[PDB]
Every structure is written in structure tokens, then in C-alpha cells.
Design a binder for this molecule. Structure first.
Ligand SMILES: OC[C@H]1O[C@@H](O[C@H]2[C@H](O)[C@@H](O)[C@H](O[C@H]3[C@H](O)[C@@H](O)[C@H](O[C@H]4[C@H](O)[C@@H](O)[C@H](O)O[C@@H]4CO)O[C@@H]3CO)O[C@@H]2CO)[C@H](O)[C@@H](O)[C@@H]1O
Ligand SMILES: OC[C@H]1O[C@@H](O[C@H]2[C@H](O)[C@@H](O)[C@H](O[C@H]3[C@H](O)[C@@H](O)[C@H](O[C@H]4[C@H](O)[C@@H](O)[C@H](O)O[C@@H]4CO)O[C@@H]3CO)O[C@@H]2CO)[C@H](O)[C@@H](O)[C@@H]1O
Ligand SMILES: *[C@@H]1O[C@H](CO)[C@@H](O)[C@H](O)[C@H]1NC(C)=O
Ligand SMILES: [Co+2]
Ligand SMILES: [Co+2]
Length: 434
């Protein structure tokens, strides 16, 4: 796709701290850009939509190539249309924003410049951020994570994409998303099947795969940390069901692990660590600091801070595994206890290390789940299982919670606020900000 300018594109600024092993941190100034899927896609020479509701223009878009040639992405009114605002080192995303149309959440990328994404090399470093999940009930997810996307959003590899990072193109993740309207400079109209429950979405014949470091998938009820490996580290197109993931009938596709080696304290047995109010170690009605460290061995460590009090990731005993570090032994023990082989089949932490050794783009979003109602995160899943089934219970939400239409109607004013992002060598982000 190309870019049009009927609506100006002004990325909301966002500062973050870059810290050094020497004990100091200096401010960095970037901004955030919304993913292409949320934008208006119209004919290059008029205001005629190329995509409207959940269907493509059969005339402007008879095939993937003709569509990309005829269509462009336009600018976004961040606040009024998408409920996205920033203030210094803070970013807030509203759940439901009503303007000419209804919008649900957003997926944003941290940019280095107005035309490029900021890349982060995680291995040997740590990522810290503050988050207020107090306004996120069951069924919602204010996610913060990393994906192996190209800094230009795909422009150099696919000439037919001239919109680039400035218009949020180039997305990929471990689900090998087939819901994307443009992948590799081409539309995804061929094979498009509209969603039966979502008026704005569908699933195309192609998907976009890549490694994903799911640092934070959470709401006020549950939270998870999950690395997802892929046989090919960076962004790569996939065909139909071979894509696997949430959008295909067979989730175990040929390149990415859609499950991951997840770590949810509640799922592991500690039901008193994270939740709303004073009866939990971490009170989700108040802001908290989340720190994730990526040691060179390939293992992942984590600690939290609230009201100045520090808490390492709680210990978990699973099979022969015991501890609080997300390592090979943990992931192997989890598959043995909870079942599955997806993570190890895709190479595990060794394969995942190949992604953290290279650059990854920061993603911040707010979304509800049209495929599983966020049950895999905050409830019992599958819903027919009981607490006796190892790993079934991941949170205290009812198995009837999270229906998109219901949560959007009942909690339209829900929101998530990410702030004070700090990145640097392990042991440095706790030092004074510049
Ligand atoms: O039609 C001419 C008219 O266009 C106006 O611009 C509209 C676009 O017409 C309309 O297609 C566009 O719709 C967006 C919508 O705002 C987003 O909320 C929505 O986001 C979805 C996304 O589609 C999904 O892929 C994702 O999973 O979830 C998100 C969140 O729900 O995406 C649709 C497009 O698919 O909105 C534009 C702004 O109102 C012009 O403003 C007007 O001048 C023209 O006359
Ligand atoms: O397009 C909408 C929205 O998508 C967001 O991406 C989400 C997907 O929408 C969501 O389906 C996906 O959820 C995965 C989850 O990551 C896995 O860890 C989980 O694995 C389960 C497994 O399914 C169970 O069988 C097993 O028992 O437990 C494991 C562990 O819980 O499976 C679910 C469903 O496939 O997560 C994606 C993010 O990682 C985008 O982030 C957002 O921007 C979009 O708007
Ligand atoms: C949960 O974790 C916290 C922090 O590590 C710990 O103090 C508490 O005892 C744990 N509770 C349970 C039930 O494991
Ligand atoms: Co093809
Ligand atoms: Co270690």
C-alpha cells in the first residue's frame, strides 16, 4: 500500500529512558504509531474505501496486487478516533472511543523517527515499565510486548509498500496473524473470510509470522510472561492454514509456536500474588513496576516493585522444577505437567535466543478477545476443565466472562496506562532517570 494525506499523521510523542551500566539514565524522545489495520484504506485518487466493514471493494481490490496498487493508508486522529494520548513518558489507551464510528482499543509501535521503528536488543539487557491495570476487568488485555519486525515496516523488501513504519505497516507475531489487510506490500483480499462476530475484521489467505517476546499480557485479574519461538526468527509470510495460530483451524502451523512457554503466577499456584485490593501481594488497583531481565544464558528473570517494595517473580514448583527463573527446565517441566510440545518443537529458549540477540520492536496495545474471550489468561480454560486438571485455572474470572460485545458495552471507559519505560543493561534501570 501507498500513503495518502486526507488526514494528517502526527505521531503522539513518547519519551523513555536509556540506562547505562555506569549508573545513569538519559532521556530518549520517540513517539507512537498505530497499526495499519486500524486506519482508513481508500483509493489513491478519491475518498472511496478499499475496505469497509469487514469486506474489500471487489472492484478496487480484485486481487492482492491490484489492490495494493489502487489503495493507500491514511492518517489517524489519535485522540478523537482512537482514544490514544501521551504525556511525557506516559501513554494511555481507552477501550471504546466513539466518533463517526466506534473504535476498540489500539496496537501501537514505539518509533525512533517519524518514519522508522525503534529496535531493541533484549539479550543481556532488561526492560522496565510502570503500568496501571486498575481499569482493566476480566476479558480485557493491556499488552506490552516485542516482535521481530523490520525497522522500516517492510519498505526495503517490498517496493509496493511505500507507506511503511510511518503508517504502522510490517506487523508480525507468533500467531502468524492472517487478519492483517496488507502483508509484504500486497493486500490480503485473496481468501478473505469475514469474521462472524466482528463487524470490522476477517481472515485472509496470508499471515505474517515472527518471534514474539510477550512481556506483559494482563488485566487487573491475571498477568502472564511468554516467549514464543519461530523456526524463522524475523517477519515471514505464511500461506493459509500452514500459518497456524489463533486465525487458522490448525493452530500448530509450520513456523511459529502459538502457545509459548508462559508464566502466569496464578496458573502456577500462587493465587494471592496479583489482584485487586490489599489481600494480594501486588494490588492491581494501584500502579506497579514490572522488570524483565534477559540473561545471556537464554533464561528470563523478573521482579516487580510497588510502593517501593520489591518482589521477585514468585517461586513455582512444577514437576522436578523449582524456582522463579523462566529457563529450559521450567519450559520442559511445564510441557510435561500441563501438556503440549509446541514450544520445544519450535526450538524452545535456544531458538528464542536468536530473536533476543537481534532487534525487536516495542508494541503496546489494548484489546479484547474475539476468539477465546481472554479465558486462557484470566479464567479456566478449556471451560469444561476443573481445578484438578493441571494448568486449567489461570485466573478467577468466570468462564462466561470476556464476551467482546458485552465488555465493550459494559466497560467502554476501561483503559490502560503504560509509563516510565526504561531500558538498559541488567541491573541499571533502577537508577536515577535523566
Ligand atoms: O468512508 C469514507 C469516509 O471515511 C472516513 O474514514 C473512516 C473509514 O471510512 C473507516 O473505514 C475507518 O474504519 C476503521 C475504524 O476507525 C477502526 O476503529 C477499525 O479498527 C479495527 C480494525 O479494523 C481491526 O482490524 C482491528 O482488529 O480492530 C480495530 C479496532 O476495532 O478499523 C476500521 C477500518 O477497518 O475509520 C475511518 C475514520 O472514521 C473519513 O474520515 C471520511 O472523511 C470519509 O468520508
Ligand atoms: O487481533 C486481535 C488482537 O490480537 C492480539 O494478539 C493475541 C491474540 O489475539 C490471542 O489470540 C493470542 O492468545 C494466545 C496466547 O498468546 C497463547 O499464550 C495461548 O496459549 C494457550 C493455549 O491456547 C492453550 O491451549 C494452553 O492450554 O494454554 C496456553 C497458555 O495460556 O493461546 C492464546 C490463543 O491462541 O495472543 C496474542 C498475543 O500474544 C494482539 O496483541 C492485538 O494487538 C490484536 O488487537
Ligand atoms: C505468592 O508469592 C508471594 C511473593 O513471592 C509470597 O510472599 C507468597 O507467600 C506466595 N503465596 C503463595 C500462596 O504461594
Ligand atoms: Co500466496
Ligand atoms: Co540465571
Amino acid at each position: 500500500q501507498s500513503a495518502c494525506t486526507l488526514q494528517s499523521e502526527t505521531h503522539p510523542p513518547l519519551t523513555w529512558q536509556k540506562c547505562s551500566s555506569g549508573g545513569t539514565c538519559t532521556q530518549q524522545t520517540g513517539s507512537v504509531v498505530i497499526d495499519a489495520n486500524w486506519r482508513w484504506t481508500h483509493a489513491t485518487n478519491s475518498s472511496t474505501n478499499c475496505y469497509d466493514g469487514n469486506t474489500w471493494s471487489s472492484t478496487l481490490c480484485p486481487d492482492n496486487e491490484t489492490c495494493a496498487k489502487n489503495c493507500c493508508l491514511d492518517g489517524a486522529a489519535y485522540a478523537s478516533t482512537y482514544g490514544v494520548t501521551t504525556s511525557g513518558n506516559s501513554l494511555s489507551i481507552d477501550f471504546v472511543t466513539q466518533s463517526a464510528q466506534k473504535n476498540v482499543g489500539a496496537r501501537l509501535y514505539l518509533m525512533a523517527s517519524d518514519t522508522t521503528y525503534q529496535e531493541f536488543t533484549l539479550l543481556g539487557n532488561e526492560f522496565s515499565f510502570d503500568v496501571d491495570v486498575s481499569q482493566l476487568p476480566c476479558g480485557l488485555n493491556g499488552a506490552l510486548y516485542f516482535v521481530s519486525m523490520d525497522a522500516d515496516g517492510g519498505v526495503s523488501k517490498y517496493p509496493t509498500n511505500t507507506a511503511g513504519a510511518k503508517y504502522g505497516t510490517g506487523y508480525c507475531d507468533s500467531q502468524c496473524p492472517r487478519d492483517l489487510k496488507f502483508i509484504n506490500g500486497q493486500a490480503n483480499v485473496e481468501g478473505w473470510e469475514p469474521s462472524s462476530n466482528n463487524a470490522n475484521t476477517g481472515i485472509g489467505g496470508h499471515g505474517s509470522c515472527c518471534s514474539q517476546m510477550d512481556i506483559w499480557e494482563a488485566n487487573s485479574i491475571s498477568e502472564a510472561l511468554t516467549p514464543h519461538p519461530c523456526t524463522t526468527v524475523g517477519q515471514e509470510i505464511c500461506e493459509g492454514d500452514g500459518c497456524g495460530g489463533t486465525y487458522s483451524d490448525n493452530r500448530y502451523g509450520g513456523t511459529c509456536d502459538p502457545d509459548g512457554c508462559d508464566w502466569n503466577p496464578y496458573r502456577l499456584g500462587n493465587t494471592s500474588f496479583y489482584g485487586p485490593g490489599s489481600s494480594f501481594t501486588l494490588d492491581t488497583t494501584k500502579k506497579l513496576t514490572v522488570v524483565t531481565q534477559f540473561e545471556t544464558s537464554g533464561a528470563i528473570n523478573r521482579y516487580y516493585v510497588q510502593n517501593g517494595v520489591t518482589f521477585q517473580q514468585p517461586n513455582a514448583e512444577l514437576g522436578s522444577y523449582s524456582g522463579n527463573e523462566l529457563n529450559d527446565d521450567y519450559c520442559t517441566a511445564e510441557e510435561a505437567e500441563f501438556g503440549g510440545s509446541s514450544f520445544s518443537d519450535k526450538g524452545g529458549l535456544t531458538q528464542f535466543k536468536k530473536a533476543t540477540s537481534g532487534g525487536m520492536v516495542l508494541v503496546m496495545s489494548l484489546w479484547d478477545d474475539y476468539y477465546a474471550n481472554m479465558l486462557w489468561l484470566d479464567s479456566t480454560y478449556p471451560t469444561n476443565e476443573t481445578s484438578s486438571t493441571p494448568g486449567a485455572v489461570r485466573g478467577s474470572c468466570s468462564t462466561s466472562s470476556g464476551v467482546p460485545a458485552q465488555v465493550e458495552s459494559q466497560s467502554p471507559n476501561a483503559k490502560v496506562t503504560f509509563s516510565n519505560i526504561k531500558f538498559g543493561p541488567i541491573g541499571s534501570t533502577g537508577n536515577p532517570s535523566g
